[PDB]
């Protein structure tokens, strides 16, 4: 039912909101490193603000669009948005992960203009990459049929998108986290416990997470928009586009609830 | 030595039976019948931001407007209370800085820490430039406080157990002070300036006499090192604070303790001691990030100064008693009235 | 050493017994005297108003 | 500490000049420099100002645009690049050291200057024109503004100077009765508002000259007409 | 509202927190590690080595390798209750513990030397301070525990001791006991070399271990490791 949805945006929005008080209140989580996750939470937090809700009246409604069109834009393009901007805060996490691994040295303590610059061009360049990859929406590009339903569909637009906002992103993080896992193993076997087996599990799991929640649903999307002899039917599409919206409720777990820091500032609060 | 032994062994039972048979009544017991004072309510005013280490020391000017901050990342910075501007930066040669000193009339400054020497800086050069004007080295531990008597002679206090009188145009210590068992931590200095008292990590506080250069009274009862010390503005009683989380008072013609003030839930120690300007509140800082406002007449607290995300290292009332500035090891100054 | 030791700290007993004292409950009484007069002039313990705070909004 | 200014001579009115001093002694980078003209038999008046760091940068309105001033700190020298010139602009120019900071006394020395030949504000006056006086006797100079130097910080912003014959001015009281370093005790000063004198307890030969008040409130700086002492 | 002097003043506040922040810059890329030890356990030998290769109080050296910065502090002269300013080198990156070999066999005015080095060790490593950070050990003297081992038999330093007098097994004894006072080893670890006459090889190692441990502190702070 439509209240599952509701019950997701009540998880992400205290998950996050849990996320954002616990960066601000700490002294020691004001650092580059938080200021991606920070963003990743912003953009979660505007997903279950400015989307979901409108995915809740449309499953309430059956689909049956009545709001003039220049709604449906608006809705389209600012889910666009926050779901690229999401993936790409993602891939900028692991990006920040790999800079702190090969290039230590400046990295340490996360402070200091060389930090402090990189991040604020990752962070912008997310935001502007977003941005620009949800324009076409706006300008009148979503060609349609029946106008009661709302959906993006454009074969010109589907391809494109979805490459520059999953394929290219997910191959980079891919890449870089298996780079990470081979420079790591190397050190080891250069200098040759149960910490560095954790930074193992921790990538494996952040990769498989990334996978299974936001690859499925992009192959169903290029598959139902280009597939020349296909069966997909609505209702894996619906749980494709359901597994991946999980991915924004089950973020802040993954990126902070594993921290020391993270963990000590949740409790705290929570103790209240 | 036998003989010698059991003499001091004798000395000292006679000083402890002279001295309780003038305890008569009790501080409480006296202040019993006056009205306590209410709850005490500070609001940080400023925030002094620059310094990018551990704040491990500060002394109020006696304008009540310029103060100078210590911290072990080698730089001495002279704020500007009112409006918050700095004044001067000194980049120490030594990063290792514990204590620092601001003279009476503001001529000069002074500072020291495991480098065992202590630098004596002129503010007003007629290049414009701050310079150290001598080094005081002699010392053969590290310095843990140091106080101006004039713009000619300074005291200073060490690691090695021993305090000196220095001599700054001769460059030469005149006097030494010997008798602590355990390394000098704080010194103190009476309005009067003929007398200073220091406290040691023998658990015991002294009483010399500048001019003589001799011991004059020896205090104890701490159950351990003590940290802090500072003279009641009457100057006739001074008080001191250690790491058993208690702070005690002492009357020099007494010669003998006060009051205590102590609470079940502090465990953690004392760093500083500071007495309020007509001596009616004693303010502490403590290892648990905040410091905690003490009524001197009744031992019974009067509120407490939260806002430091770190140790409070070090705390000072300004001479005309306007306002106290508290520093931390979270490398930010706050001024609290 | 132990012989110049126990010298020097039994002059120094013999110096620091031979000190006048007075009652605990005199000083007491001086101090809350001492306290007494100077509270009306001690802004930590009486706040003054802002006319004539120096610490304030800028 | 010593400022030697540079350059000069005749000049005609279209062409330019271009004056350079030269600091020693002192930290030339942490202090700010000013131009002072004082033509022949006229009074004093301020040029330009710049900041330590080269951050700010203040013209005089009759000099605004013709004169470009620079600052090179590495070398310990200031240059005033004069583009055009004027008849009015014949004046001897001298180069004032000014630090500002809590308790700092700005234009506490003047460099010796250098002769050029060319071939709203707050105005300061002072009755009195010259004061004959015998050596011992006590003298007294006022100055007056026309709006109040007592800023709202609780100082007034006056500035006293004397100039010897065939000497630089020198500071004496800053904001406005401290006495500035090296002058005697005799010096005193006292005022409230809109109005200020100088006293001298006891006259001295050394006391013969030209007094000048200065006001430090608002750019541009104004200088008093001049009161002379002679014996 | 200001003043024109106030305005001088405030642009010369703004000129110092510039200058405050660069050196704060300058500071933050700069490697501090601690050294700790005897005279005679080879600090001497190891701060000459380094400062070649690149009075009371404390002694500060500057060696700088692979474009990297190294600040060692040398505390040794310092002879005081440690506890009081040990907390000042909190922030320390890394420390450098210096024992001789070869004085297993020896008398101090603990008795034995080496039982007075291996109890500094335990208390510098269980230290408040230092949970989190990484100690270096050095072994200085091999080359003289080579004659000394071959004559005079382990089992004086080490009673529990029955393994071979081979001079591989009692250095590999020596290093395990030394581990083995570590009761943080899951928050920290210890890097063992081995030091002699050599000198090429005492840099790399330091170098090569400050490297680890910035990795492994940086791994901490994005949430790895
Ligand atoms: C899990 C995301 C679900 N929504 C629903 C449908 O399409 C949206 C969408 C279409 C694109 O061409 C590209 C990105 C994108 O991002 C958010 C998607």
């Given at each position: 039912?439509?209240?599952?949805?509701?019950?997701?945006?009540?998880?992400?929005?205290?998950?996050?909101?849990?996320?954002?008080?616990?960066?601000?209140?700490?002294?020691?989580?004001?650092?580059?490193?938080?200021?991606?996750?920070?963003?990743?939470?912003?953009?979660?937090?505007?997903?279950?603000?400015?989307?979901?809700?409108?995915?809740?009246?449309?499953?309430?409604?059956?689909?049956?669009?009545?709001?003039?069109?220049?709604?449906?834009?608006?809705?389209?393009?600012?889910?666009?948005?926050?779901?690229?901007?999401?993936?790409?805060?993602?891939?900028?996490?692991?990006?920040?992960?790999?800079?702190?691994?090969?290039?230590?040295?400046?990295?340490?303590?996360?402070?200091?203009?060389?930090?402090?610059?990189?991040?604020?061009?990752?962070?912008?360049?997310?935001?502007?990459?977003?941005?620009?990859?949800?324009?076409?929406?706006?300008?009148?590009?979503?060609?349609?049929?029946?106008?009661?339903?709302?959906?993006?569909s454009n074969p010109d637009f589907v391809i494109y998108s979805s490459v520059?906002?999953?394929?290219?992103?997910?191959?980079?993080?891919?890449?870089?986290?298996?780079?990470?896992?081979?420079?790591?193993?190397?050190?080891?076997?250069?200098?040759?416990?149960?910490?560095?087996?954790?930074?193992?599990?921790?990538?494996?799991?952040?990769?498989?997470?990334?996978?299974?929640?936001?690859?499925?649903?992009?192959?169903?999307?290029?598959?139902?928009?280009?597939?020349?002899?296909?069966?997909?039917?609505?209702?894996?599409?619906?749980?494709?586009?359901?597994?991946?919206?999980?991915?924004?409720?089950?973020?802040?777990?993954?990126?902070?609830?594993?921290?020391?820091?993270?963990?000590?500032?949740?409790?705290?609060?929570?103790?209240? | 030595?036998?003989?010698?032994?059991?003499?001091?062994?004798?000395?000292?039972?006679?000083?402890?039976?002279?001295?309780?048979?003038?305890?008569?009544?009790?501080?409480?017991?006296?202040?019993?019948?006056?009205?306590?004072?209410?709850?005490?309510?500070?609001?940080?005013?400023?925030?002094?931001?620059?310094?990018?280490?551990?704040?491990?020391?500060?002394?109020?000017?006696?304008?009540?407007?310029?103060?100078?901050?210590?911290?072990?990342?080698?730089?001495?910075?002279?704020?500007?209370?009112?409006?918050?501007?700095?004044?001067?930066?000194?980049?120490?040669?030594?990063?290792?800085?514990?204590?620092?000193?601001?003279?009476?009339?503001?001529?000069?400054?002074?500072?020291?820490?495991?480098?065992?020497?202590?630098?004596?800086?002129?503010?007003?050069?007629?290049?414009?430039?701050?310079?150290?004007?001598?080094?005081?080295?002699?010392?053969?531990?590290?310095?843990?406080?140091?106080?101006?008597?004039?713009?000619?002679?300074?005291?200073?206090?060490?690691?090695?157990?021993?305090?000196?009188?220095?001599?700054?145009?001769?460059?030469?210590?005149?006097?030494?002070?010997?008798?602590?068992?355990?390394?000098?931590?704080?010194?103190?200095?009476?309005?009067?300036?003929?007398?200073?008292?220091?406290?040691?990590?023998?658990?015991?506080?002294?009483?010399?006499?500048?001019?003589?250069?001799?011991?004059?009274?020896?205090?104890?009862?701490?159950?351990?090192?003590?940290?802090?010390?500072?003279?009641?503005?009457?100057?006739?009683?001074?008080?001191?604070?250690?790491?058993?989380?208690?702070?005690?008072?002492?009357?020099?013609?007494?010669?003998?303790?006060?009051?205590?003030?102590?609470?079940?839930?502090?465990?953690?120690?004392?760093?500083?001691?500071?007495?309020?300007?007509?001596?009616?509140?004693?303010?502490?800082?403590?290892?648990?990030?905040?410091?905690?406002?003490?009524?001197?007449?009744?031992?019974?607290?009067?509120?407490?100064?939260?806002?430091?995300?770190?140790?409070?290292?070090?705390?000072?009332?300004?001479?005309?008693?306007?306002?106290?500035?508290?520093?931390?090891?979270?490398?930010?100054?706050?001024?609290?009235? | 050493?132990?012989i110049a030791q126990a010298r020097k700290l039994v002059e120094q007993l013999?110096?620091?017994?031979?000190?006048?004292?007075?009652?605990?409950?005199?000083?007491?009484?001086?101090?809350?005297?001492?306290?007494?007069?100077?509270?009306?002039?001690?802004?930590?313990?009486?706040?003054?108003?802002?006319?004539?705070?120096?610490?304030?909004?800028? | 500490?010593?400022?030697?200014?540079?350059?000069?001579?005749?000049?005609?009115?279209?062409?330019?000049?271009?004056?350079?001093?030269?600091?020693?002694?002192?930290?030339?980078?942490?202090?700010?420099?000013?131009?002072?003209?004082?033509?022949?038999?006229?009074?004093?008046?301020?040029?330009?100002?710049?900041?330590?760091?080269?951050?700010?940068?203040?013209?005089?309105?009759?000099?605004?645009?013709?004169?470009?001033?620079?600052?090179?700190?590495?070398?310990?020298?200031?240059?005033?690049?004069?583009?055009?010139?004027?008849?009015?602009?014949?004046?001897?120019?001298?180069?004032?050291?000014?630090?500002?900071?809590?308790?700092?006394?700005?234009?506490?020395?003047?460099?010796?200057?250098?002769?050029?030949?060319?071939?709203?504000?707050?105005?300061?006056?002072?009755?009195?024109?010259?004061?004959?006086?015998?050596?011992?006797?006590?003298?007294?100079?006022?100055?007056?503004?026309?709006?109040?130097?007592?800023?709202?910080?609780?100082?007034?912003?006056?500035?006293?100077?004397?100039?010897?014959?065939?000497?630089?001015?020198?500071?004496?009281?800053?904001?406005?009765?401290?006495?500035?370093?090296?002058?005697?005790?005799?010096?005193?000063?006292?005022?409230?508002?809109?109005?200020?004198?100088?006293?001298?307890?006891?006259?001295?030969?050394?006391?013969?000259?030209?007094?000048?008040?200065?006001?430090?409130?608002?750019?541009?700086?104004?200088?008093?007409?001049?009161?002379?002492?002679?014996? | 509202?200001?003043?024109?002097?106030?305005?001088?003043?405030?642009?010369?506040?703004?000129?110092?927190?510039?200058?405050?922040?660069?050196?704060?810059?300058?500071?933050?890329?700069?490697?501090?590690?601690?050294?700790?030890?005897?005279?005679?356990?080879?600090?001497?030998?190891?701060?000459?080595?380094?400062?070649?290769?690149?009075?009371?109080?404390?002694?500060?050296?500057?060696?700088?390798?692979?474009?990297?910065?190294?600040?060692?502090?040398?505390?040794?002269?310092?002879?005081?209750?440690?506890?009081?300013?040990?907390?000042?080198?909190?922030?320390?990156?890394?420390?450098?513990?210096?024992?001789?070999?070869?004085?297993?066999?020896?008398?101090?005015?603990?008795?034995?030397?080496?039982?007075?080095?291996?109890?500094?060790?335990?208390?510098?490593?269980?230290?408040?301070?230092?949970?989190?950070?990484?100690?270096?050990?050095?072994?200085?003297?091999?080359?003289?525990?080579?004659?000394?081992?071959?004559?005079?038999?382990?089992?004086?330093?080490?009673?529990?001791?029955?393994?071979?007098?081979?001079?591989?097994?009692?250095?590999?004894?020596?290093?395990?006991?030394?581990?083995?006072?570590?009761?943080?080893?899951?928050?920290?670890?210890?890097?063992?070399?081995?030091?002699?006459?050599?000198?090429?090889?005492?840099?790399?190692?330091?170098?090569?271990?400050?490297?680890?441990?910035?990795?492994?502190?940086?791994?901490?702070?994005?949430?790895?490791?």
């Amino acid at each position: 039912y439509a209240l599952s949805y509701c019950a997701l945006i009540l998880a992400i929005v205290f998950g996050n909101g849990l996320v954002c008080m616990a960066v601000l209140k700490e002294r020691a989580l004001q650092t580059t490193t938080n200021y991606l996750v920070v963003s990743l939470a912003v953009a979660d937090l505007l997903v279950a603000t400015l989307v979901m809700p409108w995915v809740v009246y449309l499953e309430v409604t059956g689909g049956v669009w009545n709001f003039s069109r220049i709604c449906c834009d608006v809705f389209v393009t600012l889910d666009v948005m926050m779901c690229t901007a999401s993936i790409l805060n993602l891939c900028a996490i692991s990006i920040d992960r790999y800079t702190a691994v090969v290039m230590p040295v400046h990295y340490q303590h996360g402070t200091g203009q060389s930090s402090c610059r990189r991040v604020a061009l990752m962070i912008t360049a997310v935001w502007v990459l977003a941005f620009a990859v949800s324009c076409p929406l706006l300008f009148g590009f979503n060609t349609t049929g029946d106008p009661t339903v709302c959906s993006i569909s454009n074969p010109d637009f589907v391809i494109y998108s979805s490459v520059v906002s999953f394929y290219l992103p997910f191959g980079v993080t891919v890449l870089v986290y298996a780079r990470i896992y081979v420079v790591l193993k190397q050190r080891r076997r250069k200098r040759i416990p149960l910490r560095e087996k954790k930074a193992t599990q921790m990538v494996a799991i952040v990769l498989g997470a990334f996978i299974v929640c936001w690859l499925p649903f992009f192959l169903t999307h290029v598959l139902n928009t280009h597939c020349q002899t296909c069966h997909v039917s609505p209702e894996l599409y619906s749980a494709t586009t359901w597994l991946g919206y999980v991915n924004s409720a089950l973020n802040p777990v993954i990126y902070t609830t594993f921290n020391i820091e993270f963990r000590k500032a949740f409790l705290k609060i929570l103790s209240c | 030595l036998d003989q010698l032994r059991q003499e001091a062994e004798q000395l000292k039972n006679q000083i402890r039976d002279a001295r309780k048979a003038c305890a008569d009544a009790t501080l409480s017991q006296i202040t019993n019948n006056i009205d306590p004072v209410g709850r005490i309510q500070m609001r940080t005013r400023r925030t002094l931001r620059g310094h990018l280490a551990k704040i491990y020391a500060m002394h109020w000017g006696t304008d009540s407007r310029l103060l100078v901050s210590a911290s072990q990342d080698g730089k001495l910075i002279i704020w500007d209370s009112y409006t918050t501007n700095k004044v001067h930066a000194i980049p120490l040669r030594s990063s290792w800085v514990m204590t620092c000193a601001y003279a009476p009339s503001g001529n000069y400054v002074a500072c020291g820490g495991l480098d065992n020497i202590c630098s004596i800086y002129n503010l007003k050069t007629r290049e414009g430039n701050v310079r150290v004007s001598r080094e005081l080295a002699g010392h053969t531990g590290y310095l843990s406080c140091c106080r101006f008597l004039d713009d000619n002679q300074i005291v200073t206090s060490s690691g090695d157990t021993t305090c000196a009188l220095w001599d700054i145009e001769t460059g030469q210590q005149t006097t030494t002070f010997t008798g602590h068992t355990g390394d000098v931590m704080s010194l103190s200095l009476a309005p009067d300036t003929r007398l200073f008292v220091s406290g040691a990590c023998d658990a015991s506080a002294k009483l010399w006499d500048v001019r003589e250069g001799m011991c004059r009274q020896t205090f104890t009862g701490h159950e351990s090192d003590i940290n802090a010390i500072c003279f009641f503005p009457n100057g006739n009683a001074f008080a001191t604070g250690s790491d058993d989380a208690t702070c005690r008072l002492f009357d020099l013609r007494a010669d003998q303790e006060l009051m205590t003030y102590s609470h079940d839930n502090i465990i953690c120690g004392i760093t500083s001691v500071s007495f309020s300007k007509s001596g009616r509140l004693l303010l502490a800082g403590y290892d648990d990030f905040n410091c905690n406002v003490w009524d001197a007449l009744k031992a019974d607290r009067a509120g407490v100064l939260a806002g430091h995300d770190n140790r409070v290292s070090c705390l000072g009332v300004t001479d005309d008693g306007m306002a106290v500035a508290t520093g931390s090891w979270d490398s930010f100054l706050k001024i609290w009235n | 050493a132990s012989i110049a030791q126990a010298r020097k700290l039994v002059e120094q007993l013999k110096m620091e017994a031979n000190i006048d004292r007075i009652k605990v409950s005199k000083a007491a009484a001086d101090l809350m005297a001492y306290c007494e007069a100077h509270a009306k002039e001690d802004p930590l313990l009486t706040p003054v108003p802002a006319s004539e705070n120096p610490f304030r909004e800028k | 500490v010593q400022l030697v200014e540079s350059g000069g001579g005749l000049v005609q009115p279209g062409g330019s000049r271009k004056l350079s001093c030269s600091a020693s002694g002192f930290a030339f980078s942490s202090f700010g420099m000013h131009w002072v003209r004082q033509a022949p038999e006229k009074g004093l008046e301020w040029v330009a100002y710049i900041s330590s760091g080269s951050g700010t940068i203040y013209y005089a309105d009759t000099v605004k645009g013709r004169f470009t001033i620079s600052r090179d700190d590495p070398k310990n020298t200031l240059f005033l690049q004069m583009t055009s010139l004027r008849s009015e602009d014949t004046a001897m120019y001298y180069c004032v050291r000014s630090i500002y900071y809590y308790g700092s006394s700005p234009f506490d020395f003047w460099g010796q200057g250098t002769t050029l030949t060319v071939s709203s504000d707050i105005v300061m006056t002072q009755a009195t024109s010259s004061v004959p006086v015998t050596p011992g006797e006590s003298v007294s100079i006022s100055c007056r503004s026309s709006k109040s130097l007592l800023h709202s910080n609780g100082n007034t912003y006056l500035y006293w100077f004397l100039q010897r014959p065939g000497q630089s001015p020198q500071l004496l009281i800053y904001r406005m009765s401290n006495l500035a370093s090296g002058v005697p005790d005799r010096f005193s000063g006292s005022g409230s508002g809109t109005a200020f004198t100088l006293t001298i307890s006891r006259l001295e030969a050394e006391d013969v000259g030209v007094y000048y008040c200065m006001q430090h409130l608002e750019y541009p700086l104004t200088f008093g007409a001049g009161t002379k002492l002679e014996l | 509202t200001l003043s024109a002097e106030d305005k001088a003043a405030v642009e010369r506040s703004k000129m110092i927190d510039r200058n405050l922040r660069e050196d704060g810059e300058k500071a933050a890329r700069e490697v501090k590690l601690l050294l700790l030890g005897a005279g005679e356990s080879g600090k001497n030998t190891i701060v000459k080595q380094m400062k070649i290769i690149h009075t009371t109080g404390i002694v500060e050296t500057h060696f700088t390798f692979k474009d990297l910065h190294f600040k060692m502090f040398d505390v040794g002269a310092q002879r005081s209750e440690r506890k009081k300013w040990i907390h000042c080198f909190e922030g320390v990156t890394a420390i450098i513990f210096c024992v001789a070999l070869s004085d297993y066999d020896l008398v101090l005015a603990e008795m034995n030397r080496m039982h007075a080095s291996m109890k500094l060790f335990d208390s510098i490593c269980n230290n408040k301070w230092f949970t989190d950070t990484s100690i270096i050990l050095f072994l200085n003297k091999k080359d003289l525990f080579e004659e000394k081992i071959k004559k005079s038999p382990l089992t004086i330093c080490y009673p529990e001791y029955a393994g071979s007098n081979t001079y591989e097994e009692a250095a590999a004894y020596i290093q395990c006991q030394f581990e083995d006072l570590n009761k943080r080893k899951d928050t920290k670890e210890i890097y063992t070399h081995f030091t002699c006459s050599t000198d090429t090889k005492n840099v790399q190692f330091v170098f090569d271990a400050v490297t680890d441990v910035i990795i492994k502190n940086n791994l901490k702070d994005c949430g790895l490791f």
